[PDB]
Amino acid sequence: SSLAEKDIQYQLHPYTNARLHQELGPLIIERGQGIYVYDDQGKGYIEAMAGLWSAALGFSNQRLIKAAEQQFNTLPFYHLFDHKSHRPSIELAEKLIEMAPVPMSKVFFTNSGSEANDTVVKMVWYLNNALGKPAKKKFISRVNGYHGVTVASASLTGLPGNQRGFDLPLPGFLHVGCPHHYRFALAGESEEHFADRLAVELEQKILAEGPETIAAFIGEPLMGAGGVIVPPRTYWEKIQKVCRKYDILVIADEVICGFGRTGQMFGSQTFGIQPDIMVLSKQLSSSYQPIAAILINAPVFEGIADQSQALGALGHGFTGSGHPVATAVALENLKIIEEESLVEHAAQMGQLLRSGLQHFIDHPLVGEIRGCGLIAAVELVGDRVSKAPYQALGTLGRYMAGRAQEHGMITRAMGDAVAFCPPLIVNEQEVGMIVERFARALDDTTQWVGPGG
Amino acid sequence: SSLAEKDIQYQLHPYTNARLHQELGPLIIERGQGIYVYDDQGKGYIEAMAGLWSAALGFSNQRLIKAAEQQFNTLPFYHLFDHKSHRPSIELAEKLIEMAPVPMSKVFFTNSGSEANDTVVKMVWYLNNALGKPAKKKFISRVNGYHGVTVASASLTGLPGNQRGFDLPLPGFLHVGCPHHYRFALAGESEEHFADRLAVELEQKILAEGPETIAAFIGEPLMGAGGVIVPPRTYWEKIQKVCRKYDILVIADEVICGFGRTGQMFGSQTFGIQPDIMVLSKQLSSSYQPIAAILINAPVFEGIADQSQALGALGHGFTGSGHPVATAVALENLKIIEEESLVEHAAQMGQLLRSGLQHFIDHPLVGEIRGCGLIAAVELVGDRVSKAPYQALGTLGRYMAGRAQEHGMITRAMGDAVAFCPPLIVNEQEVGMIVERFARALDDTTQWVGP
Numbered sequence A: 001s002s003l004a005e006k007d008i009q010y011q012l013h014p015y016t017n018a019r020l021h022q023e024l025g026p027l028i029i030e031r032g033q034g035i036y037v038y039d040d041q042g043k044g045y046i047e048a049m050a051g052l053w054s055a056a057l058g059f060s061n062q063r064l065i066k067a068a069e070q071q072f073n074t075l076p077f078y079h080l081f082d083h084k085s086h087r088p089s090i091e092l093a094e095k096l097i098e099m100a101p102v103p104m105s106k107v108f109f110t111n112s113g114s115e116a117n118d119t120v121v122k123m124v125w126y127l128n129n130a131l132g133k134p135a136k137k138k139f140i141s142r143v144n145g146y147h148g149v150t151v152a153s154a155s156l157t158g159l160p161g162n163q164r165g166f167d168l169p170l171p172g173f174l175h176v177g178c179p180h181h182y183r184f185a186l187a188g189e190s191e192e193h194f195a196d197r198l199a200v201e202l203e204q205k206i207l208a209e210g211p212e213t214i215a216a217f218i219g220e221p222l223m224g225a226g227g228v229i230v231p232p233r234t235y236w237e238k239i240q241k242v243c244r245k246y247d248i249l250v251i252a253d254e255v256i257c258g259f260g261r262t263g264q265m266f267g268s269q270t271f272g273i274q275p276d277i278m279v280l281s282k283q284l285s286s287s288y289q290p291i292a293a294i295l296i297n298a299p300v301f302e303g304i305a306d307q308s309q310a311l312g313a314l315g316h317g318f319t320g321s322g323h324p325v326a327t328a329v330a331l332e333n334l335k336i337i338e339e340e341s342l343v344e345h346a347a348q349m350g351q352l353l354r355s356g357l358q359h360f361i362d363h364p365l366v367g368e369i370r371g372c373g374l375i376a377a378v379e380l381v382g383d384r385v386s387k388a389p390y391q392a393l394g395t396l397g398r399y400m401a402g403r404a405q406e407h408g409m410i411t412r413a414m415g416d417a418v419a420f421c422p423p424l425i426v427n428e429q430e431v432g433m434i435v436e437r438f439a440r441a442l443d444d445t446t447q448w449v450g451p452g453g
Numbered sequence B: 001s002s003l004a005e006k007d008i009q010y011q012l013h014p015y016t017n018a019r020l021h022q023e024l025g026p027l028i029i030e031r032g033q034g035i036y037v038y039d040d041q042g043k044g045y046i047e048a049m050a051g052l053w054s055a056a057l058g059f060s061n062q063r064l065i066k067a068a069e070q071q072f073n074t075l076p077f078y079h080l081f082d083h084k085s086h087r088p089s090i091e092l093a094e095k096l097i098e099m100a101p102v103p104m105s106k107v108f109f110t111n112s113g114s115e116a117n118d119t120v121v122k123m124v125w126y127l128n129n130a131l132g133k134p135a136k137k138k139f140i141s142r143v144n145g146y147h148g149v150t151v152a153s154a155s156l157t158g159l160p161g162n163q164r165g166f167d168l169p170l171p172g173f174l175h176v177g178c179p180h181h182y183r184f185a186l187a188g189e190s191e192e193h194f195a196d197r198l199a200v201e202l203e204q205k206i207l208a209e210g211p212e213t214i215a216a217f218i219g220e221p222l223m224g225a226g227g228v229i230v231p232p233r234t235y236w237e238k239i240q241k242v243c244r245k246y247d248i249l250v251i252a253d254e255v256i257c258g259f260g261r262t263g264q265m266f267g268s269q270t271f272g273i274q275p276d277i278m279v280l281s282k283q284l285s286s287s288y289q290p291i292a293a294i295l296i297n298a299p300v301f302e303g304i305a306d307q308s309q310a311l312g313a314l315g316h317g318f319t320g321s322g323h324p325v326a327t328a329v330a331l332e333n334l335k336i337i338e339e340e341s342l343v344e345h346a347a348q349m350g351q352l353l354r355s356g357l358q359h360f361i362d363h364p365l366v367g368e369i370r371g372c373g374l375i376a377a378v379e380l381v382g383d384r385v386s387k388a389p390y391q392a393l394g395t396l397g398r399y400m401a402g403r404a405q406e407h408g409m410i411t412r413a414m415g416d417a418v419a420f421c422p423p424l425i426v427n428e429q430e431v432g433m434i435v436e437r438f439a440r441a442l443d444d445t446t447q448w449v450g451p
């Protein structure tokens, strides 16, 4: 049996057509260094997605590898249950709280973003029970938001591909509009007026459901998996005013935006969000270890703490919560981002990326170029006036991602948008190569379509 | 300022009274080796729980540490999304399928047991939708079952401490009886007759709810966190007959029983279970890495595969699913358990543990001694005839666990029971020291409850 045949025989792949997988088999990645990964045929690819929006320090950071080794040789596993603790969880929790963009009280650790959002749902239910508000339990999120894949976090998620066939969302998980001007604004509507309508939609939803029943609003500062969607100017200001009016918690899902992706340390800084709760993962450890973190502010902690006393202990925890190797690696990761000034470097590299893409702004298949900091997307269309796809929605995106791979670059299609989320350590020449490989994929796609006109 | 002050300032602890934590602060564990961990004062403890039922190879296995290093220096992160793959996920998946106690088709990887059970819930809903059985969605689990802490997996969990204040269980998550003879059998009732009644209870629950609405039955072969509860003889045989009668999937939650804990490689082998789906974690990697695995049989895979084609792709996955470092470490872990014959060693050490504990069978505070393989529990009671607690359920267990810690042993209280789940590598004299530290804690507890 080849390694590819064993993969087909034995693995059910996430986010894969399992039948198509049996026909095509895997693309096997063997090794990585810097921004590059290599398949088992020796072909090199720029990982323009940093794997899953996540590998901040690239694929061969020796400081993270040595930090793991040092913690393995000290204490390779322990837990935080029943007052037990360990230095790496303590020092990471200190660093996260002290770097938070708003006053935060406590950190709770999980393995995944999905577990973290699932945990926030439980914590908000627990909190509102503690405060004697037992009706105050519904969550509001957005169409095309991504918050993970547990039964509860896939209910916060607003992407239909995460819900169809899974009987989701659960009751009590509500969705308001995707704040994407290009796709959902009225013809000739300003960003500010689009923001007004989205804030009216949220308030009308709160009033229709009964304000006393709405616990929390959750949003990525800018939406990652849903299309690299930058919210319209004044959106977050106007949404937060509605939330504060009805005593609704604001949860910033920073799993992608966290640690320098958007031009500042946090998306909450870039977009002027004052969240009660923040969720962090992915770049937290450059994904070298599975870890996520929840930051809760004083009011959330105090109500949870009170009830944990009344009921004996907080009845919640994962075996891996605060895992000493995962926390040790994340701690070293955050030190490197600070010591190497990678927030500012990412901002400078993002200006080069966006300038490079904008040479194609009048291309007949380029509908929108969006992003900020070191996250971007190009949304392709078959027709710029109607914004209609070429053939089925997703055709151009899939074709572009296929061509990008052939030209030695891994991007991700989100319908007809192709994403860019390179490692923060990407250098100026490397940004040049990412845009060159985009241009080659676009040329191939243009020849395949034949736009004429 | 001190590390303890920083912990109090910055960390919300799982499974902790947060207010008592602000007063007492943490017990900081600095380092581990073999079956031992050490606090920041240099005091050594036998980790009689292997951390969280999990550290099979103990706290200083150099082969796991080198396996991590080697994978880190090759490919420290990649994913399995959109047909991407990597060698350690492939070779671990191969090994898990080829070692499975019943024919299995595919492995799906997660970080946690909770994520894995949450994923099984979604897979069963997805499957029954694919098969055109949209009503076939309810799960049956058991009182005192532990299946993790997500909104959905805490609904499978049957421990009130996991549900009170969290508005759980969700609708469609049903519970039948805890198969604990000592607590739930009628006067003079045999194990076999207790099993008969539990099988009737399950069938009656299925008929009351409508069989066409029941998707799955999930059980730990023996219940870990809920009390180290060994099911009565013939339970699993009779429960499976009921499940097969109504076309209900049998899910074996092997997160604690997996990889030699119960005297054989799997709890499904020890208890004669033929599951459709198995869930594995904890000893999978000796918890050196967060990883869990779901094994699905051919019919579950075929229905999910068909739906994943109809819907374009399987719309499910964690960033960490099959993480190359976590999979490389788990693969090496399973090789060590096989190469070092730790299943047979654990069985031999478990006989010593259980015989050592059995000397306390006539102690006036010992209500029951239970276990199987290298997992055991001693349940304390304030009165052996009535089986009543002292003051309130949990009072004895809390005090016992605290005294065990003072005598250099970390155990875990499950109400008034203290658990034993030592690393598989524990030696004979180390089992003797576990029983001695238990005995010292029991003496302390006896004097504390007093005359």
Ligand SMILES: *Cc1c(COP(=O)(O)O)cnc(C)c1O
Pocket: A053, A111, A112, A113, A114, A115, A117, A146, A147, A148, A149, A220, A224, A225, A253, A254, A255, A256, A281, A282, B317, B318, B319, B320
């Ligand atoms: C990736 C992601 C998650 C889920 O994290 P996992 O570790 O994959 O479960 C949640 N929210 C956002 C915004 C994400 O991008």
Ligand SMILES: *Cc1c(COP(=O)(O)O)cnc(C)c1O
Pocket: A317, A318, A319, A320, B053, B111, B112, B113, B114, B115, B117, B146, B147, B148, B149, B220, B224, B225, B253, B254, B255, B256, B281, B282
């Ligand atoms: C520990 C455990 C789980 C949950 O695993 P986590 O990794 O802690 O989420 C599930 N089932 C059983 C039987 C367990 O013992």
